[PDB]
Symmetry: none
Subunit: 162 residues, 4 copies
């Protein structure tokens, strides 16, 4: 059996979501949370990770609301060893390497603040994340003018040196 379903990630506007595949849930949920604290001062987040054996969604973080939401999204996804992070006061570009560098992390499915979906397949054994829909799909290739625009915007955002 292979039934596929689409899960809409529930998160408030401005909150960044990161979905990944890990190992050793009881240790990692806490250890990865500690690691996230070292990435950006003031980062606020919730992290939840699924443990297969007891079929439990573990969670922690340093923000009640994001913790509740991370756990809710994680248990819905259900897939074993999948972890969900919901954060604010930090961007994926400031934390992805910290996550990829964690010894119990296998991979990261995706990360952003766009409307986000997790595609899950369920078999007679359990569930598996087969992909993520990170926002709407692109359907046109940028023009030279649009190239200039994005580059000016990147500098305006703060990625500029003297």
């Amino acid at each position: 059996m292979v039934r596929i379903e689409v899960i809409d990630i529930e998160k408030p506007e401005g909150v960044e979501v990161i979905i990944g595949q890990g190992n050793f849930s009881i240790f990692t949920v806490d250890d990865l949370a500690r690691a996230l604290l070292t990435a950006v001062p003031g980062i606020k987040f919730g992290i939840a990770m699924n443990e297969a054996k007891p079929q439990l969604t573990r969670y922690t973080g340093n923000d009640p609301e994001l913790e509740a939401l991370a756990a809710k999204n994680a248990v819905k996804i259900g897939a074993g060893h999948v972890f969900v992070i919901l954060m604010k006061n930090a961007y994926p570009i400031n934390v992805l390497n910290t996550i990829k560098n964690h010894p119990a992390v296998a991979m990261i499915y995706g990360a952003s603040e766009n409307p986000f979906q997790v595609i899950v397949a369920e078999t007679e054994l359990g569930r598996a994340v087969i992909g993520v829909v990170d926002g709407k799909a692109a359907n046109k290739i940028e023009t030279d003018e649009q190239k200039k625009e994005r580059r000016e915007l990147v500098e305006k955002i703060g990625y500029k040196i003297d």
Copy 2:
């Protein structure tokens, strides 16, 4: 071999990071761009010495930290050494970004303590032989002091629910 002890000049609260790299004209700009990705709002100056033309290159996003980074770098003089002075971010938030850079060999040290760079000089040029990162420890912590620091670490913000 002549040995000099250079006091790093930096404002109170400013973090300094000294390292050894390569390809100065490219790296001074590229590492600066990388630092911008480490922590939003980070303010810094970075300078790096180029041997051939004997020039201290520099950039960043803060006039004063750039001038100070360049001053410290040229006083150190050693080729391919880079000096970073930053604020609005801590070493623990950026060291991996620096170690991850393809033109970086190593990082001598990083902190906000009174800092010194020990430099050796030969007939060719100079070499960083070590760094004095603050005062030296002279007492091993007691069990009570262990509890003290662990409570402080949590109070600083390193705590999870």
Copy 3:
């Protein structure tokens, strides 16, 4: 590179300061100190002079306090071959010629008991004294009455002959 900074001379009220440019620091700090002793009996002072090669501020004198202060001021000025003198029980007019006539002295930047500043320029090589602010600046020309006043005061101070 040329960064300019202003250094405020730290000294007790009533203490006279003399800043100069010399040569052969290890010899001169001691020899000039000996010379000062011949200028006015009872003179108490501290003298410090910067030696470039070892980047050390040398000092001596015959007063612990003035010696510590002279060295503190000299090391912060930093400029090689610059010497700083802090004295009491003697006035500049009693010792300037002794200093100017020392064989290892190039010049004297200034001397007085007014609030005093040393303007220093720093390059990639080292530091240089580019000037001294000897007290507040004059902004008005004396009147004939003030002229009579200062002349009476000079006599009252003791510059009067029978």
Copy 4:
């Protein structure tokens, strides 16, 4: 040539300085002003002989030292000679001030020793031909006496840290 030996009259502890100058009416006053700049609190009398009116000019800031300086100067008589009697200052503190004066040619001697001025006299006037500055030495110091004077010089106040 007649030769006279003049004993300088001065109280114990007073220092005498005899010199040869020029332009007496200006110099007696100007050199006195200069002496005041040498050491704060200096007390003295200065007299100088003017040839054409055959007058001994004098000034200073001490009535008795002035009277004595003038008496000694007129007894010496020689034109353009000046005599200084001072206290609250030593020759080592003022000799350069005197030598630096534009109207001073030379300084014959200076001390607090028993002092004599040897004067020669012609049909025109008088001339200082020398000074007897205290007793004459008759023994060369021993190595031990060297140590003795050097310790005394430091004790007097000529010592640095």
